[PDB]
Amino acid sequence: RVRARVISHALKDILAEGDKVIIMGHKRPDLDAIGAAIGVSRFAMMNNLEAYIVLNETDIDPTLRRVMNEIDKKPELRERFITSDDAWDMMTSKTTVVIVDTHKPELVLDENVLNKANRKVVIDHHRRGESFISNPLLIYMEPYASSTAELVTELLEYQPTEQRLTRLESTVMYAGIIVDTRNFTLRTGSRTFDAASYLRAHGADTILTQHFLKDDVDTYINRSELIRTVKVEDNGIAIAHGSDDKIYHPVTVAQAADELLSLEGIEASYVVARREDNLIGISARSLGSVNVQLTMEALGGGGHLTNAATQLKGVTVEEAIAQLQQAITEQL
Amino acid sequence: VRARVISHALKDILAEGDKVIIMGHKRPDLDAIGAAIGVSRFAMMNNLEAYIVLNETDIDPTLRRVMNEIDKKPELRERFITSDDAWDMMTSKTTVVIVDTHKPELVLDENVLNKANRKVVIDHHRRGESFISNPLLIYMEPYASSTAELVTELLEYQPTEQRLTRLESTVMYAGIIVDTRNFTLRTGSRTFDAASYLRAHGADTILTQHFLKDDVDTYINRSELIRTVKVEDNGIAIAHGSDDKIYHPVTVAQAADELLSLEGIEASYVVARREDNLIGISARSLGSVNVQLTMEALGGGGHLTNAATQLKGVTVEEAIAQLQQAITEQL
Ligand SMILES: [Mn+2]
Ligand SMILES: [Mn+2]
Ligand SMILES: [Mn+2]
Ligand SMILES: [Mn+2]
């Protein structure tokens, strides 16, 4: 964590050297993007700098809308959020733009604001890709961190404490970590917990966080409809499916596969369900022993060791299942 | 600095006696076992002789999954002994460390506790009526998530040549997971500090998940109930089992708990037959709607957020009608 100290003070000099700070994450921002951004704006405010977060009404999905409702009703946080246009009008060549939770120009919330910026900072927890923000004054990329919220939280700890992180700000930063880690089950290191400690110390509300993230009744029902069918082999391979005649939401199929991993005896889950009139979807997950990337690549799809997917043209659910088992027996 | 003071005081007490006997509560859960394992690592860090009392009849199915892993590590497996062996090896200079409880009658083996001349108590519950007599040291903190969290703090101030192992860390961590329902309850910054320390010592999330796997049958029973839920505009939800199927009381309770995790639901009522002549209802609430009053109105009771009742002599449909009438009245 030598890096966090140096980066925190280097960041503060860059931000203070400019006339003000404009913060953006990726398009259709999730709670890590928004929590990280909130975090940076608190970073700016601890040093009495002027900071805004770019967000348009059309960027606000249902999860984020629950966060924003809370922000409107219970603090003064809303004043920091500004539209693209207001962002544009307000920028000068001395304005520092900080990009959080992405590093590809084409994924940035507003690429025009990005292109107008002479001064850029990038903070993200993925590894550098093909595209990358051009000519940044400072790059803070940590592939092994849980989330951008975690990275930003660490930077806060080095800054003056007079203008402290508020309860609601820390709650959104916390929610972002919860989402990116699947409640501390993925990409969670001791430093993730260090960040969780700092945030909870500043009032991060675990109950409110749960509230932002509740699924609805229909999703639970559709999902359990898939789970109910599960057949678990002795080797820990579980297959579940929807009727050939029922269309399922792709996310519901993914969730079903996720949830089967919480059940006794299941090492790897495969959920098979109609996605379109002429397309069958499969989502696969595993706890690391069985490689589902391999299974799905054998069926013309792909992904990663623990989570992959494929889609099959012009087959019935029963045919897809048979193709799937053929692949499994071959692989295992 | 209080934990620092407790850590060092406890070390002198343990090194003063001839050996250490560690004991949790009857029917130990993962926090009681995790804490006990932590106290045994505490002892080994100072090259002291420590055992954990555990009888085969004290090992429920969750704990068995854990003991299956511990069996793979003889160094750790050998620390676990029966009540008989503990009693037999105890002396006037043996220190007994009671973890995760403070009531004599709740301790795993009261006979061992009664034979003990030197006692230490580490727990995270509010002190009540009966209490361990004449403790040399007491570490009680009703705000902590768990005893594992408490013991982790003590470990931090001890020599590190003989560190907490990956498996030991994992069990302690799983204890915190169970007691906080995955950082959702009774969880403070210090809880996360403990998690950080355990994780730095290799605490394994995937193994923890293995310990806490849910049975498939029961997931399927629970969801049969949930599937039926009907949610009113006021956030009141009612779910039911069919009139001809008996559900286990614990499954009904879990279903009621699970409904509160769904959007728009302020209070849940789950109605399922529990016998040939008895209908059960578990009621739960986020804390706004009072289900104690509803249940009391139906000849039951409990608490504001969590209550229940049993209705003799009605079908599920009648129980539902009567429940709605109570709900209407309350409103
Ligand atoms: Mn993101
Ligand atoms: Mn992220
Ligand atoms: Mn306990
Ligand atoms: Mn406990």
PDB file of C-alpha atoms in Angstrom, chain A residues 146 175-188 251 254-255 258-259 285, chain B residues 182 205 209:
ATOM      1  CA  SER A 146     -12.466  -5.422  -5.754  1.00  0.00           C
ATOM      2  CA  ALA A 175     -23.016  -0.465  -1.958  1.00  0.00           C
ATOM      3  CA  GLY A 176     -20.617  -0.274  -4.896  1.00  0.00           C
ATOM      4  CA  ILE A 177     -18.228  -2.631  -3.158  1.00  0.00           C
ATOM      5  CA  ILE A 178     -21.108  -4.976  -2.261  1.00  0.00           C
ATOM      6  CA  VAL A 179     -22.167  -5.109  -5.936  1.00  0.00           C
ATOM      7  CA  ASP A 180     -18.730  -5.635  -7.456  1.00  0.00           C
ATOM      8  CA  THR A 181     -17.875  -8.338  -4.901  1.00  0.00           C
ATOM      9  CA  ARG A 182     -21.235 -10.110  -4.723  1.00  0.00           C
ATOM     10  CA  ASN A 183     -21.359  -9.408  -1.015  1.00  0.00           C
ATOM     11  CA  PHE A 184     -17.694 -10.184  -0.328  1.00  0.00           C
ATOM     12  CA  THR A 185     -17.631 -13.511  -2.227  1.00  0.00           C
ATOM     13  CA  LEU A 186     -15.530 -12.361  -5.238  1.00  0.00           C
ATOM     14  CA  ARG A 187     -12.296 -10.378  -5.614  1.00  0.00           C
ATOM     15  CA  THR A 188     -12.267  -9.706  -1.891  1.00  0.00           C
ATOM     16  CA  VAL A 251     -30.688 -12.194 -16.550  1.00  0.00           C
ATOM     17  CA  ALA A 254     -27.920 -16.100 -15.234  1.00  0.00           C
ATOM     18  CA  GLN A 255     -29.261 -15.596 -11.690  1.00  0.00           C
ATOM     19  CA  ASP A 258     -25.636 -18.235  -9.731  1.00  0.00           C
ATOM     20  CA  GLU A 259     -28.086 -19.420  -7.043  1.00  0.00           C
ATOM     21  CA  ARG A 285     -21.221 -21.069 -13.251  1.00  0.00           C
TER      22      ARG A 285
ATOM     23  CA  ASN B 182     -22.811 -12.286   5.764  1.00  0.00           C
ATOM     24  CA  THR B 205     -14.574 -17.735   0.938  1.00  0.00           C
ATOM     25  CA  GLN B 209     -19.511 -21.248   1.178  1.00  0.00           C
TER      26      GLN B 209
END
